[PDB]
Each structure stands twice: as C-alpha cells, then as structure tokens.
Ligand binder design. Sequence first.
Ligand SMILES: *[C@@H]1O[C@H](CO)[C@@H](O[C@@H]2O[C@H](CO)[C@@H](O[C@@H]3O[C@H](CO[C@H]4O[C@H](CO)[C@@H](O)[C@H](O)[C@@H]4O)[C@@H](O)[C@H](O[C@H]4O[C@H](CO)[C@@H](O)[C@H](O)[C@@H]4O[C@H]4O[C@H](CO)[C@@H](O)[C@H](O)[C@@H]4O)[C@@H]3O)[C@H](O)[C@H]2NC(C)=O)[C@H](O)[C@H]1NC(C)=O
Ligand SMILES: *[C@@H]1O[C@H](CO)[C@@H](O[C@@H]2O[C@H](CO)[C@@H](O)[C@H](O)[C@H]2NC(C)=O)[C@H](O)[C@H]1NC(C)=O
Ligand SMILES: *[C@@H]1O[C@H](CO)[C@@H](O[C@@H]2O[C@H](CO)[C@@H](O)[C@H](O)[C@H]2NC(C)=O)[C@H](O)[C@H]1NC(C)=O
Ligand SMILES: *[C@@H]1O[C@H](CO)[C@@H](O[C@@H]2O[C@H](CO)[C@@H](O)[C@H](O)[C@H]2NC(C)=O)[C@H](O)[C@H]1NC(C)=O
Ligand SMILES: *[C@@H]1O[C@H](CO)[C@@H](O[C@@H]2O[C@H](CO)[C@@H](O)[C@H](O)[C@H]2NC(C)=O)[C@H](O)[C@H]1NC(C)=O
Ligand SMILES: *[C@@H]1O[C@H](CO)[C@@H](O)[C@H](O)[C@H]1NC(C)=O
Ligand SMILES: *[C@@H]1O[C@H](CO)[C@@H](O)[C@H](O)[C@H]1NC(C)=O
Ligand SMILES: *[C@@H]1O[C@H](CO)[C@@H](O)[C@H](O)[C@H]1NC(C)=O
Ligand SMILES: [Ca+2]
Ligand SMILES: [Ca+2]
Ligand SMILES: [Ca+2]
Ligand SMILES: [Ca+2]
Ligand SMILES: [Ca+2]
Ligand SMILES: [Mg+2]
Lengths: 349, 445, 33
Amino acid sequence: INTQVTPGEVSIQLRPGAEANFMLKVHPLKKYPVDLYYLVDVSASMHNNIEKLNSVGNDLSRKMAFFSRDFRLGFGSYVDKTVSPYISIHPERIHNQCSDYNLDCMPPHGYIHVLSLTENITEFEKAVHRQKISGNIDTPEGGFDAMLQAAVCESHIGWRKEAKRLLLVMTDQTSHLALDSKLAGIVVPNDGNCHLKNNVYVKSTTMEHPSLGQLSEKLIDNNINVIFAVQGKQFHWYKDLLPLLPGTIAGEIESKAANLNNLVVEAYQKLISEVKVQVENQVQGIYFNITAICPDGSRKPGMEGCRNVTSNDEVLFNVTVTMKKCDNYAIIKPIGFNETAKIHIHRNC
Amino acid sequence: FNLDVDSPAEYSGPEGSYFGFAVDFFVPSASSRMFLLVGAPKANTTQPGIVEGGQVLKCDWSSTRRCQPIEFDATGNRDYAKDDPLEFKSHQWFGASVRSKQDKILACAPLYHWRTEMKQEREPVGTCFLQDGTKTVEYAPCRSQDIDADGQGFCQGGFSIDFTKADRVLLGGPGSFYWQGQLISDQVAEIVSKYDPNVYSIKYNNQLATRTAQAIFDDSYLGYSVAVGDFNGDGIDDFVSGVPRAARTLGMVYIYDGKNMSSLYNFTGEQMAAYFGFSVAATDINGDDYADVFIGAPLFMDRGSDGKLQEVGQVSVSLQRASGDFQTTKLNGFEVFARFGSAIAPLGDLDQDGFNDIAIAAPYGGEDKKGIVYIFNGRSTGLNAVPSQILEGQWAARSMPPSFGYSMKGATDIDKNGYPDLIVGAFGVDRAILYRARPVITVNA
Amino acid sequence: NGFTTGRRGDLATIHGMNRPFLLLMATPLERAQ
Ligand SMILES: *[C@@H]1O[C@H](CO)[C@@H](O[C@@H]2O[C@H](CO)[C@@H](O[C@@H]3O[C@H](CO[C@H]4O[C@H](CO)[C@@H](O)[C@H](O)[C@@H]4O)[C@@H](O)[C@H](O[C@H]4O[C@H](CO)[C@@H](O)[C@H](O)[C@@H]4O[C@H]4O[C@H](CO)[C@@H](O)[C@H](O)[C@@H]4O)[C@@H]3O)[C@H](O)[C@H]2NC(C)=O)[C@H](O)[C@H]1NC(C)=O
Ligand SMILES: *[C@@H]1O[C@H](CO)[C@@H](O[C@@H]2O[C@H](CO)[C@@H](O)[C@H](O)[C@H]2NC(C)=O)[C@H](O)[C@H]1NC(C)=O
Ligand SMILES: *[C@@H]1O[C@H](CO)[C@@H](O[C@@H]2O[C@H](CO)[C@@H](O)[C@H](O)[C@H]2NC(C)=O)[C@H](O)[C@H]1NC(C)=O
Ligand SMILES: *[C@@H]1O[C@H](CO)[C@@H](O[C@@H]2O[C@H](CO)[C@@H](O)[C@H](O)[C@H]2NC(C)=O)[C@H](O)[C@H]1NC(C)=O
Ligand SMILES: *[C@@H]1O[C@H](CO)[C@@H](O[C@@H]2O[C@H](CO)[C@@H](O)[C@H](O)[C@H]2NC(C)=O)[C@H](O)[C@H]1NC(C)=O
Ligand SMILES: *[C@@H]1O[C@H](CO)[C@@H](O)[C@H](O)[C@H]1NC(C)=O
Ligand SMILES: *[C@@H]1O[C@H](CO)[C@@H](O)[C@H](O)[C@H]1NC(C)=O
Ligand SMILES: *[C@@H]1O[C@H](CO)[C@@H](O)[C@H](O)[C@H]1NC(C)=O
Ligand SMILES: [Ca+2]
Ligand SMILES: [Ca+2]
Ligand SMILES: [Ca+2]
Ligand SMILES: [Ca+2]
Ligand SMILES: [Ca+2]
Ligand SMILES: [Mg+2]
C-alpha cells in the first residue's frame, strides 16, 4: 500500500537480551502536490512588507509548475495576545493602537484565519490585497501560538494528506516564549488543542504560549514543513533554533524583498532533497538503534539521516531493535513525509 | 526524608481565587504565636466599586484553620478630578507576592493600572502595602513623575520581592525601560516615615536602584525573580535577580552588591529559550558558611539517548568559594513537560545534620500532572543529587491544572519540635498545604 | 507628529510617518520650453 516508505509494517518477536534488525527503505517520489500556507505577521513593524505580497501570486505558481503536480495557497495573520502589557488598554487605543499617529490600523488579534487553501490564485491575490496592519507595544510578537494554531486546526485551514504540507511564517522579529505570559496574569499552560471558532483564535487571551518542545511535537505530528522567512537581524535568532526544531528551514529576506519567490522555491528544493527519521517509542526496555545508509555510503547516526537525496535514488535505514527488559509498538517516520512505518513489535517475557 | 505526608495540615480559600499563589510564615516574636500567610490574587474583596482586588489571608495553625484576610487596604479608587479616577484597583492581582520578616508583612500588586497625572492613561506600575505592626503603609516606587513604556510606566513593580537581613526591601520590576527590567532596594526605616496619603511620587533618601541601559537589552525581564545572600564577604546581603531572556533568550542571572548596587558576578545559560533565571534561591547548602546560588530553567530541552530532545528542565547549583569562584553543577528533571526547576526554596536543616537543605518543585509533573516536589539534602561536598523524598499533590484538576508546587516556603518550625517545616500552594484548586518535619533518631546498633 | 518621545518596540517604524514634510510642485525637466 505504501509507496514512499517501505516497508510500511513489520511484526517482530524478541526475547530479553537479544537484538533483531531489518531494512527500511525510503524512496522519495518524483513530483509532490504542494500546499503552501502564508502565516503572515501583520504587526506594525511588518507594514512595509505586506504590500510585497501582491507579487507572490502568479510568479511563484509559475516558478513551482515543474516541482509540483498542482499548487495551493492560503493566508492568515497574527499580531499578539490582546491583553496588557502587550497592547494598550486605553479605550481609544485598545481597538486601534496606531491612533496616536492617525493610522487606519486594524484591531489587534491573536490570530485570524483568512483564506483556506485554494488553487485559485486570483482568490489569493484578492484576499491579500484587502489586508490591513495592526499594532501593539512589545518588541517581540506572538508568532509561535499562531503557528501551533495553524498546525493543529486541520479542516479549517484545509490541509491535504496527499500533499507536501508547507507553512511559511513571515516575520521580522523574535517571538514570544511560553512563560512570558506571566506578566499578563496568564499562568495556564497551553493544552495543544486548537480553538478556532469563527476563524478567530478565541483562547489567545486565557492560556499561555506554547514552548519549543510542544510546538515541535505538534508540528511533526501533523507533517508540517515550516519555512521561516525572517527579514531583519532576527534571522540569526530564528536560525540558531533550527537544531531544537527538527525539519524546519530559515531563509533571509533582504531589504528589497524581491527575493521572496526565490526564497520559497530554494527552501522547497532543499527541503525535498533531504531524508531523516525519528522514532516515537513508548515501550519499556526496548531501545532502537538506527544508522542511515546514504547513497554515498556514509554511516550517519540516522537521527539527521542522509541529505542531498533526489529521485531515482533510494535511501535505506539500517535499524537494530534491542530487548533489554520486560514489562505496544513504535512507529518510525521520516520527518516531513506523509507515510509512516508501523513496527508492530511483539514482546514475550 | 522526614517530612510527614501522613498528616498534612490542609487549607482552602474561595473557589477560583488563586488561593495559594504565594505563601509564607508569620512569626511575630512579640505575640509568640505562629501564623501562615497566603495570597489570593483573584479573590473578591469588600472594596466598593472594585471587582477581584486580591486578598492576603492570614491562616492560623494552632488547631484553628480560620483564614482572616489582612485588611491591608479597604478603600476604592482615589480620584484626580470629578469622574476622573486616579487608579484602577480592579483585577490588580494583589497578594501575588507575600514576604514576612519577624514583624512586617509586604504584599504587592503587579497589575495595578493607574491614570498617570499628566494624561489619561492606564499604566501597570504596581504597588505594595507594607504593614508594620499597627501602622500600614503603601510602597510604589515605580509610579513616578517620569513614566511611560520608555520609562518605568510598565514597571509592574512587585512582581518579585524579598527582605534583606538589614531591614531593606528588594523590589523587582520586570517591565521598565521597555522590559529591560529593574531592581529597587529601600529600607523599611524610611518607607514608614515617608508616607503622605495625599502624595503619589515619594522620594526616598536612601534608595538604591538600577538604571537604564542600551536598547539591545529590551525584553530582558530583569527582576523576574529576586533573592538575597552575602556574596562578597562584607556581611550585607547582596541582591540576586534572574533575567530569563538576556543574550538572545539564553537567560542570565545578575548579582549586585548590596551596599551600592554595583555589579559583582554574572551567570549565563547554555540553551536558547530555556528560561535560565526563572527562579533564584541563595542558600548555604554545603555548610561551609558561604552562600550558594541556585538557578532554575524550567523549559530546558535535553537530548535523549536516541537523539530526540526532551523538555525536562534543569537546576544549576553553584557553590561559592572563598576566592570569588563558583563550582557549578547541573541537575536535570525527571518527567518531560513537567517544568522541573519552577520553584526552589531553602528548607533550613530539615534533618539537623549540619548542612542546610533545599527542595525543588515540578508543578506539572507526577501522575495525572497533579504535581511533585523533590527534597534534596546537603553534604560536605555540596548538594546530594538524588532526592531523598518525593512529595506529591493529592488534588485533581477542576478546570485548570492544580499546579501543586508553584509556590512553597520553609525554614521555620511551627510545631516548635526543633525542625523546620514546609508549606506548599496548589493554587489551581485554591488550596495550600502544610507539612511537618518529624524528629530524627540515630540508632547505633 | 514625529516629535513625541522616542518610541522603541513595535511602534518604532510607525512613528516616522506623517512626519512634517515638503510638497514640491515644479515643472518636469522634459517640458521646459
Ligand atoms: C554582567 O552583565 C551585565 C549585562 O551584560 C553587564 O552590564 C553591562 O555593562 C556594560 C559596561 O558597563 C554596559 O555597557 C555600557 O558601558 C559603557 C562604559 O563606558 C566605557 O566603556 C565602553 C566600552 O567600549 C567605552 O566604549 C566607553 O567609551 C567607556 O570607555 C557606558 O558608558 C554605557 O552607558 C551608555 O548608556 C547610557 C544610557 O543610555 C548613556 O547615557 C551613556 O552615555 C552610554 O551611551 C553610549 O552608548 C549609546 C548607545 O546608543 C550611545 O548613543 C552614546 O553616545 C554612548 O556611546 C553602558 O553602560 C551595559 O549597558 C550593561 N548592561 C546592563 C544590562 O546593565 C555587567 O557589566 C556584567 N558584570 C560582570 C561582573 O560581568
Ligand atoms: C477565482 O477567484 C476570482 C476572484 O478572486 C473569481 O473571479 C470572480 O468571478 C466572479 C464571477 O463568478 C465575478 O463576479 C468577479 O468579479 C470575479 N473577480 C475578479 C477579481 O475577477 C474567479 O471566478 C475564480 N475562479 C473560478 C474558476 O471560479
Ligand atoms: C501520501 O502521498 C501520496 C502521494 O502524494 C499519496 O498517494 C496518492 O493516494 C491517492 C489516494 O489516497 C491516490 O489517488 C493517488 O493516485 C496517490 N498518488 C501517488 C503518486 O501514489 C498517499 O495516499 C499519501 N498517503 C497518505 C497517508 O495520505
Ligand atoms: C545493517 O546492520 C546489521 C546489524 O543490525 C549489520 O549486520 C552486521 O554486519 C557485520 C558485518 O559483517 C557483522 O560482523 C555483524 O555480525 C552483523 N550483525 C550485527 C548484529 O552486527 C549489517 O551489516 C548492516 N548493513 C549495512 C549495509 O550496513
Ligand atoms: C467576584 O465577584 C464578581 C461579581 O461581583 C464575579 O464576576 C462574575 O464574572 C463572570 C465572568 O467574568 C460573570 O459571568 C458573572 O456574571 C460575574 N458575577 C456577577 C455577580 O455579575 C467574579 O467571578 C468573582 N470572582 C471570583 C474569583 O469568584
Ligand atoms: C548502536 O550501534 C552503534 C554502532 O552501530 C553502537 O556503537 C552503539 O552502542 C549502539 N547503541 C545501542 C543502544 O544499541
Ligand atoms: C549532491 O548530489 C549531486 C548530484 O548527485 C552532486 O553533484 C553533489 O556533489 C552532491 N553534493 C555533495 C556535497 O556531495
Ligand atoms: C561598591 O562597594 C564595594 C564595596 O567594597 C566597592 O568595592 C565598589 O567599588 C563600590 N562601587 C561603587 C560604584 O562605588
Ligand atoms: Ca508583540
Ligand atoms: Ca555583600
Ligand atoms: Ca557554600
Ligand atoms: Ca540536612
Ligand atoms: Ca516541625
Ligand atoms: Mg513587529
């Protein structure tokens, strides 16, 4: 049944003090239907860059006509949590933080979903063209909470299981962390469900941000391939976090922002030219050992896997299951891929 | 290992009032009786026109658990002019930080917005009420003549507080100077004697504070948590504060000289976005008469065996030496997502051996994420890195997680059995719990 | 506008617009005579 990750299932029996093995082969496919989502920061700092979203409609779809069977796009915006001291609570400023500068800024909002994924590029251009900016006070902005909400809500955004889910997060500044909410009286940890009721993030103001570990777990669970597109010096901040966030890419947007379509397409090519795996083991005493066999023969430890992969090129993962102590299964999946291998490990004591 | 979990003394506040957010002991030696002190930052009050002010309920231990709120303040919002309120006490989170010397109580409100004098605004400067026996005072050094987001307008003064052993109050405002942070030290012998109930910006003669820095230090959050202890041999306690977003969210911890607020030593985290400096507690854990630093990083992500990362938390132990050096050791948590290292509190000498002890909490750990507290014992070398006792919360989550272990206190014997005790606050179910340390006998077979 | 206290944080960019400016009306170089 599985086409890209073979074998898709393995039944093995082990006895304590013994070790088994098999071969797991991952063969990337030629072309991928791509679903891209623009989780765009629309804070006051990002005002000069929203207008540069009118070019990405047709140009990118032309650039990505050979790398993908079909194409989809979507939109969505975030600024921050709408409580003090992140926003002003003055009755004049609470609904337009820019009013002291005579601007038509939109009311701040934790996260609003705008356009579900559609193959109509004219719809994407129309949705982007009518979009305004908002404002707040703090230097960082609440991007990670919006990222989690966009990753988890599936039928609202409109992700495809048959696609290559990508998520572009366009910003220019560092994001808020988990425990930064304690200044605002939010001491309730994030639960990891998603709470879009009318395409507005209702619970942005009652539970705090997600941490890096929770965000990463939710991203990899839903097969989301994140592509940060940061602009200022904070590209480096978003880059040094890549080790802590598997399967994420960071590109730099120059001042002219003419390098946006290229950023997306080169990031997609680098994304498609890599394979790596992890294991979600919840069994007691069983330790997994995986060494990757690159087409150049390298004996990489597998956790970062083999890079520079293309099609016409099959990558093989050497596994070694141990049985150390007695008292389920483990699923080993290539991060970013849509298929997983279910190692239905039997254990007998 | 001697704390008694068979007979914990229970306490309870109003539902949904965050009872137990901050805990402490009250021991007025003049009255020779022992009282708890619990904050309820979401409690309703008697104040007119104020909803959800905050209460500091003084609870008794001697067989009567009656919690009588301390009347730190009874009035509503003072006014600037007709229908021009000067301050906004609603939802002020009063009592989120309770500290008690032998005969003083200092409870602070960090979310106290007010209408600045120059223009109609809402600036969360924060305020504190210092009750000294009979006299009650108000302490609010972050509402001043020069305030805005630029200045200390968003100071949130009173997010963290502590008492120096020399009658000073160390106050930490995380949000001043565009969230760079600030520490302020001032003596009680002047807080009381300088309080005009009709003056807002009061100038204190002998106050020590930290000033503005370069714009690259924004969102550092200095003063997110404070502690005291002698660290350069002068004898006067020195101000230790945690700045958990410095150096590109690595986290740092500063130590300032307690005589003139001059920087002495710095620490630095090793992982980005780990919250180094979230909790700071300076005790003497190896018994060598030199105070030792403890630092919490609840969100540290630690490599697993296979290479997968786990967010388990980490506590850094740093033993002060006689030459100005620090011998540092790490200490990792036990359950993923448990936020080990959230709260650290010295216990005194929990078993009377000669080396003070310490306890570290993992509020979201344990079975069904009720909460767990770990008990550590000192040695001649330093801390003993395996916990002797595991304290677990007994309360299920009603709406939000019980958060058993968010705040805790020790080092005072309430039974007067000779050994220090411990109170813990599981504010997610509006409870506090007291634990008693049993006497220890050495059998020599 | 543009002269209130130095705004840092998220408002720093926005502070600069509506700044006092000049409005120049001159003939084009290509249509002199
Ligand atoms: C523990 O860790 C903390 C934090 O990392 C650290 O505190 C930091 O200390 C440094 C040094 O004291 C602070 O940086 C600056 O230090 C200079 C000292 O001046 C002399 O040294 C510099 C070094 O190159 C020389 O260039 C200079 O000419 C002198 O010889 C201060 O002068 C700085 O003050 C500036 O800010 C003031 C307020 O804005 C201004 O009024 C003042 O004029 C200075 O302005 C300068 O910079 C401006 C930048 O825009 C510029 O516009 C001005 O024209 C001028 O050039 C400043 O103090 C740093 O701020 C501290 N950070 C924090 C958070 O406190 C501790 O030292 C460290 N301790 C230990 C023991 O490790
Ligand atoms: C793709 O979306 C565009 C709008 O973004 C659609 O064009 C609209 O078509 C309706 C008729 O159904 C007209 O009344 C509108 O004036 C059109 N808008 C624009 C901007 O031209 C287009 O029909 C959509 N594609 C398909 C196949 O339906
Ligand atoms: C993973 O992706 C592949 C291709 O992107 C999916 O394979 C397609 O499956 C649909 C039905 O599910 C078929 O109609 C197509 O013909 C298949 N295409 C190819 C190229 O094989 C596969 O189903 C996806 N797996 C999951 C679990 O969503
Ligand atoms: C894949 O891994 C297995 C181990 O699980 C390798 O099998 C070992 O091969 C070496 C080479 O001769 C033998 O000395 C060992 O006795 C074999 N078994 C074990 C348990 O080590 C196998 O060679 C690997 N294949 C590749 C292509 O790397
Ligand atoms: C303190 O009392 C006030 C009322 O005086 C309570 O306010 C309630 O707030 C909820 C949601 O904000 C409303 O649905 C209720 O209608 C309010 N009550 C009334 C009587 O109007 C507040 O919940 C109380 N605080 C606590 C901690 O119990
Ligand atoms: C995994 O295999 C490597 C060599 O293939 C070996 O050095 C290592 O000890 C093994 N680890 C486990 C847990 O089996
Ligand atoms: C990646 O693959 C291409 C094509 O096989 C090859 O030319 C290139 O040298 C490879 N990169 C590295 C670093 O070996
Ligand atoms: C602060 O006091 C200590 C005590 O000796 C001294 O070493 C230091 O130089 C003083 N700092 C300032 C700025 O006066
Ligand atoms: Ca923000
Ligand atoms: Ca000192
Ligand atoms: Ca010591
Ligand atoms: Ca001891
Ligand atoms: Ca006792
Ligand atoms: Mg911004």
